[PDB]
Design a protein around this ligand. Structure first.
Ligand code: HEC
Ligand code: HEM
Ligand code: HEM
Ligand code: HEM
Lengths: 74, 74, 370, 65, 98, 237, 56, 181
């Protein structure tokens, strides 16, 4: 029935820091939530590095070309 | 269309876990690599032999073309 | 409240058995926007005059601050564009997208929109393959009797290619992506009433799932591979696909010994070049493309996919040999070891499609009794 | 003064593929000169002597310079 | 000889490795949507769980172990009775209209 | 046809740059030799800045040559010493004069010739150093010459280069070879004024995309992990 | 651990989250260019302007 | 079945006390399509170079078969365009359209899209009012302190109007109607 129901084991998949059912969470959760958002953040860093350079190319294309500066001061 | 009025389901159970409670890449090398090969052994025989002939027709296509520009004894 | 229509890209039902192939289904949205974005900034210094256009390209690659990249993010971007399509489209055959008749036809009109667009994009810089690349193809439309000379002269703006031919393309070429930009939404609209189509071919209504976390990032992962495979070429081998000759100025009074348009026509151009007759191959050309509209009347199997039709896989990957052959055979000249090929390869193309893929389902149904 | 190239071409005419193509070139040379009217030439044997030549030169030439 | 091939080709399709049947892989048109709709619950629900898990494994590109695979002799024709019933009504629906 | 080999270079490597010292002597060649009959119109002295010469030094060459510029207030035109904005001195005013100065044949431009000819450099370096005696059974009009790398093996190319044809600044050997090195190094720069910078973004890309690609591939595998580990069952009566 | 102590300080609150990124990105920018250019100089030593920028 | 969205132009509820003013509400759809249609065929012979653009207009008005009309169906069309708007917009005040806050703001972004568009459309032929018509207006953006000189020089493609100023508009000007579309 709905009580004979049982949950299998994910110990083949879980993190090592939680496999001991006798322990408790809240001692690694703060870390487990940190390592993954670190990937989210570190990802977000490099995308921003891409944006500053890739856009400035286009914007600096809108800028005065090299041909004009030759005629500017002289 | 959206969720709610698609179809019928009866007597089905779904178990699943947070991502945080499991490593992202467990058994990648350990279990993935055979599954790669198993995926390979089911497809190579119906994919390669065209490309096998292609490599040959790409070969003989040059050699005969290579000889034709080379002269004849006359 | 235009927030409810953008649920189709956020909260849309879609399957879960999905490969990495369907990254390609959305990269075009990234190719197209990027390509437009590139080309738009690019046309800030293009000029639509014969006497200066080729030079006006040189105005970019030399004197603009980091603009020289933009010639190649755009140009070789157009190659990565097509690399998606013939991985996007052969998909629909290997999985059975083409039953969605209201959508599959839309997937054609894009292709002829693009392959007639791109033809107007290689020609702008007056490369000495621009000119003849426009001459040969456009000359063929003289093949028709009693009107071929008219429409061709009518499009040439005279009796032959000239300045007047150029500007007429640059506007026709700067515009169609926007026409594609809206047709893109149409192509997704008829989808929206039915949704996607798994590799198995089974109606997966039971297992349709959200879209914002899962396939968004998955597509972004593909876009990364695209930008990678795009940034590689421009940085490491931009002269690879874009033929060398196109850096030559235009001159009608001299040809190269060898002619070939850009690589992607070549599966199709070879079909025509096979036929010694003039007109007898032209109708085969568009037929080779417009056969796609004609396939879905040839879904013989009451299955859908080809993951569960092993014999279809024997034919399907054999078709790729023919295309990838005609690709190479097209880009090579007219001599005896190669003419013998295209006289077969052209026939093989029409043959595999209209005889043997139908023949499969008529058999595979009989192999399993329905 | 000297061309360093000749120093390198000189050594390579001794190697196998050059000597063999050289001998073929000589019979070609006499195949043509001996005959009176010929629409034939030793562009045939010349290029194979040279496609084999310059491959060795590739290996080492910019070591000097 | 024939019958060795139907068993053989049935193994090369692969859908016996994903716990599926012959009927489950059918293309869906209006003629069949009726038939599926006509199916009983004891069997209809048994369709979905066969399908539902094969999808989850197609996601992973995984399969089931050899024991769970489907045997040719057990490839039951549970759907054909409901199907040909329909087209017996289709062809009557049309020729009678002629 | 004839396929040139793949001669190595100081820049063939996918993070290799150009030896600017080699360029510095290469530019001497074009002015002393090739600028008599080659019309490089897509370049100016200013582009040499930050590459081989400086502002004032390269400007000394603009002072050297006269250039036709300026409608006089009389309504006529004149000659002045050029400047850094001025493109190179065109040898001849039009193509036809070049055909007239030759045996009916035209010199091509050399701005983008490298990227407009298969093999690029390796064609050119072996072109000059492919001169030899014609073979037996061949005949050529006057003005034409033999060179196997050119299509048809027949060309109106007077031999431009030879050992001790000129001298260079620092005093390196004026062999037929070293000169042939700097010049082909020079022309690649013509159709690529960005080589020094292409590799720079050529490198910045990898240590980003090589660094991101795992992380995004993890964030993928992060979210999908719910379904990479999802189990089911079937419990009707 | 460093991972956990990092979480409670910065990656917890969203208004704090974007602060780390642009800051670290700014400090990251100053390093990445210096890393690449020196290496690009390390490879092609004796070829660039700055290695002939003293003779003239 | 994209036939259900085009009921908004076929089977849409709408009032019955309606004047002739609201003709103008849809003429823009006709002005815009016509104007685009005109200009598109028109740019088949425009040239984005200083040395030839003004002449390239003359290429039309003289040598093209009935093309000379197209300079004016388009140009003076742009006047009839604006005649609709300030009869379309003052309407909303005289009747009270502007309560539809989500719509009224959209009605602005068009106007600045157009009035900055049209500014790029009068300038193409180099009329001696094109130039100064572009100088004066654009010069004003130097009014800002510490950035005005930058953005203006940045848009001028130099230090003053030139060939580089032209092409940068012709693309910015050939495009926005589609953004409006
Ligand atoms: C005496 C005038 C003159 C000099 C000096 C000269 N050239 Fe040439 N060049 C010509 C002419 C004339 C042609 C025409 C070749 C032909 O018509 O096939 C030509 C052809 C060429 C080509 C065309 C090759 C191709 O694939 O089409 C190149 C490249 C070239 N020269 C480079 C050079 C180089 C390198 C040098 C110095 C080593 C040089 N030129 C010096 C007159 C000259
Ligand atoms: C599917 C859409 C398009 C295709 C297939 C296409 C095709 C091409 C190709 C292959 C080139 C290469 C020319 C070269 O490398 O020298 C090119 C150049 C060019 N494209 Fe397009 N293009 C497309 C869209 C656009 C767009 C959207 C714009 C502007 C917004 C544009 C403007 C230009 C211009 C001005 C050039 C000249 C640059 C050059 O020739 O190098 N194109 N086009
Ligand atoms: C700019 C051009 C295009 C855009 C923006 C576009 C967009 C899309 C997108 C986002 C999808 C969903 C992704 C997926 O199904 O994997 C899709 C699917 C599809 N596309 Fe494209 N596409 C384009 C070109 C084409 C072309 C040339 C064809 C040619 C046949 C085509 C045929 C299809 C079909 C049949 C589907 C259905 C997918 C399925 O059956 O599961 N599309 N399209
Ligand atoms: C709201 C949209 C637009 C406005 C306000 C506008 C404004 C103008 C105006 C007033 C002229 C008159 C020039 C003259 O009479 O000499 C003009 C010329 C021109 N328009 Fe635009 N235009 C618009 C859209 C377009 C479009 C859609 C195209 C192309 C599809 C285009 C291309 C041109 C060209 C090439 C010219 C030069 C012809 C000339 O100056 O006579 N314009 N524009």
């Amino acid at each position: 029935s709905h009580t004979d129901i049982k949950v299998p084991d994910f110990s083949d998949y879980r993190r090592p820091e939680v496999l001991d059912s006798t322990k408790s969470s809240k001692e690694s959760s703060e870390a487990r939530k940190g390592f993954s958002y670190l990937v989210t953040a570190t990802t977000t860093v490099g995308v921003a590095y891409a944006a500053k350079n890739v856009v400035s190319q286009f914007v600096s294309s809108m800028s005065a070309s090299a041909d004009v500066l030759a005629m500017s001061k002289i | 269309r959206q969720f709610g009025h698609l179809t019928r389901v009866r007597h089905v159970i779904t178990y699943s876990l947070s991502p945080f409670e499991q490593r992202a890449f467990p058994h990648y090398f350990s279990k993935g690599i055979p599954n790669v090969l198993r995926r390979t052994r089911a497809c190579i025989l119906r994919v390669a032999p065209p490309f096998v002939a292609f490599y040959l027709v790409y070969t003989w296509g040059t050699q005969e073309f290579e000889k034709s520009k080379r002269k004849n004894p006359a | 409240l235009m927030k409810i229509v953008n649920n189709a890209f956020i909260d849309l039902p879609a399957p879960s058995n999905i490969s990495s192939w369907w990254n390609f289904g959305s990269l075009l949205g990234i190719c197209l926007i990027l390509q437009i974005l590139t080309g738009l900034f690019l046309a800030m210094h293009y000029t639509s005059d014969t006497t200066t256009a080729f030079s006006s390209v040189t105005h970019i690659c030399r004197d603009v601050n980091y603009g020289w990249i933009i010639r190649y993010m755009h140009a070789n971007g157009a190659s990565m564009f097509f690399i998606c399509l013939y991985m996007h489209v052969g998909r629909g055959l290997y999985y059975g997208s083409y039953t969605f008749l209201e959508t599959w036809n839309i997937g054609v009109i894009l292709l002829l929109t693009v392959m007639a667009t791109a033809f107007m994009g290689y020609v702008l810089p007056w490369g000495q393959m621009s000119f003849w690349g426009a001459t040969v193809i456009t000359n063929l439309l003289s093949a028709i009797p009693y009107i071929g000379t008219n429409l061709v002269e009518w499009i040439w703006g005279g009796f032959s290619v000239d300045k007047a031919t150029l500007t007429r393309f640059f506007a026709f070429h700067f515009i169609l992506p926007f026409i594609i930009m809206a047709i893109a939404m149409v192509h997704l609209l008829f989808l929206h009433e039915t949704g996607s189509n798994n590799p198995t071919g089974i109606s997966s209504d039971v297992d349709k799932i959200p879209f914002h976390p899962y396939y968004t990032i998955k597509d972004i992962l593909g876009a990364l591979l695209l930008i990678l495979a795009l940034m590689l070429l421009v940085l490491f081998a931009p002269d690879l696909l874009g033929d060398p000759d196109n850096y030559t100025p235009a001159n009608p009074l001299n040809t190269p010994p060898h002619i070939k348009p850009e690589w992607y026509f070549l599966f199709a151009y070879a079909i025509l070049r096979s036929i010694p007759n003039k007109l007898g191959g032209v109708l085969a050309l568009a037929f080779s493309i417009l056969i796609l509209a004609l396939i879905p009347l040839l879904h013989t199997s009451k299955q859908r996919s080809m993951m569960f039709r092993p014999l279809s896989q024997c034919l399907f990957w054999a078709l790729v040999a023919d295309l990838l052959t005609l690709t190479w055979i097209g880009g090579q000249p007219v001599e005896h070891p190669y003419i013998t090929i295209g006289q077969l390869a052209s026939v093989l193309y029409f043959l595999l499609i209209l005889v043997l893929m139908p023949t499969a389902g008529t058999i595979e149904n009989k192999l399993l009794k329905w | 003064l000297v061309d360093p190239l000749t120093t390198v071409r000189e050594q390579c005419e001794q190697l196998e593929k050059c000597v063999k193509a050289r001998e073929r070139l000589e019979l070609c040379d006499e195949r043509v000169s001996s005959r009176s009217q010929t629409e034939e030439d030793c562009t045939e044997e010349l290029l194979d002597f040279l496609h084999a030549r310059d491959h060795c030169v590739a290996h080492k030439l910019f070591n000097s310079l | 000889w024939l019958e060795g091939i139907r068993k053989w080709y049935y193994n090369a399709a692969g859908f016996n490795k994903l716990g599926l049947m012959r009927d489950d892989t059918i293309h869906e048109n209006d003629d069949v949507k009726e038939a599926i709709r006509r199916l009983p619950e004891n069997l209809y629900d048994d369709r979905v769980f066969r399908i539902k898990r094969a999808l989850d494994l197609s996601m992973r590109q995984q399969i089931l172990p050899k024991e769970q695979w489907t045997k040719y002799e057990e490839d039951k024709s549970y759907l054909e009775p409901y199907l040909k019933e329909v087209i017996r009504e289709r062809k009557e629906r049309e020729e009678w209209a002629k | 046809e004839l396929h040139p080999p793949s001669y190595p270079w100081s820049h063939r490597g996918l993070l290799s740059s150009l030896d600017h010292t080699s360029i510095r002597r290469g530019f001497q060649v074009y002015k002393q030799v090739c600028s008599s009959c080659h019309s490089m119109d897509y370049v100016a002295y200013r582009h040499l800045v930050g590459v081989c010469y400086t502002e004032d030094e390269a400007k000394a060459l603009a002072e050297e040559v006269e250039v036709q510029d300026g409608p006089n207030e009389d309504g006529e035109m004149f000659m002045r010493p050029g400047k850094l904005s001025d493109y190179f001195p065109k040898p001849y005013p039009n193509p036809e004069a070049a055909r007239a100065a030759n045996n009916g044949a035209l010199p091509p431009d050399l701005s983008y010739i490298v990227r407009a000819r298969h093999g690029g450099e390796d064609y050119v370096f072996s072109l000059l150093t492919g001169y030899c005696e014609p073979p037996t059974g061949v005949s050529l009009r006057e003005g034409l010459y033999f060179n196997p790398y050119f299509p048809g093996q027949a060309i109106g190319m007077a031999p431009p280069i030879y050992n001790e044809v000129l001298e260079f600044d620092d005093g390196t050997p004026a062999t037929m070879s070293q000169v042939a090195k700097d010049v082909c190094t020079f022309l690649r720069w013509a159709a690529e004024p960005e080589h020094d910078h292409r590799k720079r973004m050529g490198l910045k890309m990898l240590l980003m995309m090589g660094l991101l690609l795992p992380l995004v591939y993890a964030m993928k595998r992060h979210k999908w992990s719910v379904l990479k580990s999802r189990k089911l069952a079937y419990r009707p009566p | 651990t460093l991972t956990a102590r990092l979480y409670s300080l910065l990656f917890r609150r969203t208004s704090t989250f974007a602060l780390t990124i642009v800051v670290g990105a700014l400090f990251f920018e100053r390093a990445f260019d210096q890393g690449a250019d020196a290496i690009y100089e390390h490879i092609n030593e004796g070829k660039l302007w700055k290695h002939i920028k003293h003779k003239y």
